[PDB]
Symmetry: D2
Subunit: 116 residues, 4 copies
């Protein structure tokens, strides 16, 4: 699994469950093409978005739908969504974990990249 | 000054100087329209992007050009840029500070909204 | 002002006001000795903890009383306090800003060291 | 495993390997008693510090030896060590993951607490 997402909730000290995630790739015409989507599990993890074959070199945008998440917990947060944009696989295939740590008015995001 | 940007460097423990910042406003057709831009000062701050009159309610995107920043320092970064997307509200506090704390493979961003 | 503290609230998107801060210096016998204290202002800042004369090289601990802060807001926090432990150096930049960004179950802390 | 530690390096986008961790408990006389210690693995994780029997209620301090870590990578960091202090097990046994994300002049720490 070459692209995975893991989301934590910094208010509750828990995984952020059921968080929608949309992934896009930059096409040759410079538009954002839909690439994959899913939702975090009870563990706050999202796997199986793509395969090593389909996850070719390119610029990817991982949108994490944080506003929707917070509004279901009765919180009106600042951001619409967290937006993680990066070049992938430009030095050959890698595995990527995109982590995000959520607070109503702040988030952080970290990438862990490994060589298979 | 209703919208300010402040950028820190977590490797050097310093303001992030000369970071390009581009602000966009979401148009009716859901496209991103250029709104304001600048470069952070010696103090890592960017002031005077807009005015109270022009900064109406709506969805904005603040793009922080982190890749170029790390490149100029000879450090290989992960992200193309940092993206901060939010709704500007008239109800709440009047002044928005978008703060960002940069590391090569991680960043955080915080909104400080005050009267 | 060689040592400043700035605290933000990541839940409210605001300065963290009235947060108690205790600074300690490591004594020769490796114990922590009270050095300075205060409470953050309306702007989440604490200035005037020490002077250039008194702030000699050594190991310092800045204790930020985060539990009491969350308690006063009726929110259950994880940490007893935030702890920032560092060596003050004469070689590098002269002014230390210890920044902290608080959430109930997480915090970050950053050192901004400037001339 | 009721107490685990996971450390990431925000410069490299990798687990922080071989990071020393010392855990202390507050004794009835208000001193910090040594409780456990270890080092993060190749995955940046540290398990097996304690058992559910020995991990009783109390105030614990998890010291993560960050300065030593950075100095081996040629970096002179700001902090001596990250110091995570918390009450544990005061509402019955819980599992704790203490995460830390390291940069030379900044770190964050997050707790994920679950009910077994």
């Amino acid at each position: 699994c070459p692209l995975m997402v893991k989301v934590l909730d910094a208010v509750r000290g828990s995984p952020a469950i059921n968080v929608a995630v949309h992934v896009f790739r930059k096409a040759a015409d410079d538009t954002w093409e839909p690439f994959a989507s899913g939702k975090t599990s009870e563990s706050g993890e999202l796997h199986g978005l793509t395969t090593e074959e389909e996850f070719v070199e390119g610029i990817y945008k991982v949108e994490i739908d944080t506003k929707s998440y917070w509004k279901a917990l009765g919180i009106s947060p600042f951001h619409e969504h967290a937006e993680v944009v990066f070049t992938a696989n430009d030095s050959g295939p890698r595995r990527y974990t995109i982590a995000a740590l959520l607070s109503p008015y702040s988030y952080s995001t970290t990438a862990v990249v490994t060589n298979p």
